[PDB]
Design a protein around this ligand. Sequence first.
Ligand SMILES: CN1C(=O)CC[C@H](C(=O)N2CCC(O)(Cn3cnc4ccccc4c3=O)CC2)[C@H]1c1ccccc1
Length: 326
Amino acid sequence: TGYVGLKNQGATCYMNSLLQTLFFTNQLRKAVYMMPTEGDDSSKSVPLALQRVFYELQHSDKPVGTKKLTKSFGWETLDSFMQHDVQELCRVLLDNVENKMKGTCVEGTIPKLFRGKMVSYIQCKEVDYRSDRREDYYDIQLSIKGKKNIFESFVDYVAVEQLDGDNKYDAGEHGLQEAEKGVKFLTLPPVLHLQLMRFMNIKINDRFEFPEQLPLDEFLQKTDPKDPANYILHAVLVHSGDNGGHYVVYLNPKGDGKWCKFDDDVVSRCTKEEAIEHNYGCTNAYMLVYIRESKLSEVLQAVTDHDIPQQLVERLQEEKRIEAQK
Ligand SMILES: CN1C(=O)CC[C@H](C(=O)N2CCC(O)(Cn3cnc4ccccc4c3=O)CC2)[C@H]1c1ccccc1
């Protein structure tokens, strides 16, 4: 295919799979390329290290290396990747970029793409007291045990939990109260990152199905008729084994349904079934990326070589020059 892969270089684990996921989030990729890293240190700037890994995956006829990126955000102990989990690596990457874009023509791009909003609420049954606290979110964590498919997870996720018995709610002035607490989606981000809670640690390999096409209007408190909350499957992040483990990701970068498996240094076309149903559950998904139907075409906009400023290309090329002292 057109696509190049990332070298295996450590217990980097899910890093390689997550790098491809962010790379084919094209609208991100092009914003990342607009960051002004011109004056930045070549060895300890994460923004500059995302630019290079992105640049390389757009230009490299050979597998791309990530040693410099690893070294930039400094996860360099023996259990650095073992100890953390996927959302965490992405928050380190996205928060670096988000901050680096502030005061550029591409400010707010990370929140625009990834940020949804949520209300968490507790209501006393017996007495008149109610707490409501809005929340932003960049990623949602879905429960998997006792759930057969994503819809049950989402249903479980908006479930009303009962605060009764010894587990009653402390309602301040009103004493210990019988109460209902739960969560509601006020909005859903153009790009929807979901984590399946398979680690409880131990790895549950149970059966859990997710759709090619994911309609989530019934989870919104207010359904927009003009922009219905329908999602398209984009990446399927895969682990096989335990403690043991291999990582790969499945992508259809264009949103079109022509899938490839991204297995580090090698990239290969595959069936939808390999990417979707074959990861339902030792080879199973732990993270899903979905793009909203209305926003598919902006997010997966075309990326030309000219979309990279030549100041950057010169810097990077220069770097490549020295390094090439073989
Ligand atoms: C087997 N195994 C190890 O030996 C070491 C860590 C390893 C791992 O790569 N992880 C990244 C992906 C995950 O982050 C998914 N996830 C995300 N958020 C969660 C929030 C709350 C509750 C659970 C979760 C959760 O499981 C897990 C940790 C883990 C693993 C476990 C399940 C699948 C694949 C690999």
